[PDB]
Ligand binder design. Sequence first.
Ligand code: TVU
Ligand code: CA
Length: 126
Amino acid sequence: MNPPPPETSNPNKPKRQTNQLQYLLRVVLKTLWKHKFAWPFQQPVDAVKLNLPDYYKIIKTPMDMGTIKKRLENNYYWNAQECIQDFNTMFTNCYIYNKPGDDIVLMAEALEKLFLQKINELPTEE
Ligand SMILES: COc1ccc(-c2cn(C)c(=O)c3cc(C(=O)NC4CCS(=O)(=O)CC4)sc23)cc1OC
Ligand SMILES: [Ca+2]
């Protein structure tokens, strides 16, 4: 079985919007989401459908851009660092689970490169 997906809201977690969080949704996530290689990362890994019975034996901190998108839309994060951590977790999971130089790894590496280019212009907190 698949695990439940990561939460995208939590009534006990303080919510916030900041201009860096806006930029993460409006520019960074937008750019990655529309990229040709986004598709394997737009939703939680369906280990059942993909026949990966060991995926969640190995990956205990799953993350995907669909979750990140909903979190941003829900103002789930307190700061940009929390969101950046989620992107980094998503990339890292892909590197942990897959052989180096598998096509999925190259895709994640391309998205990570673009991610860093886009966050290079993250605005100051105003
Ligand atoms: C909607 O279709 C997909 C949705 C998600 C994925 C996918 C996403 N992510 C993040 C992964 O890490 C991932 C890993 C996958 C995979 O098949 N890996 C195995 C084959 C390559 S390996 O031997 O390096 C490790 C085991 S499929 C997949 C692949 C899909 O189609 C191929
Ligand atoms: Ca392949």
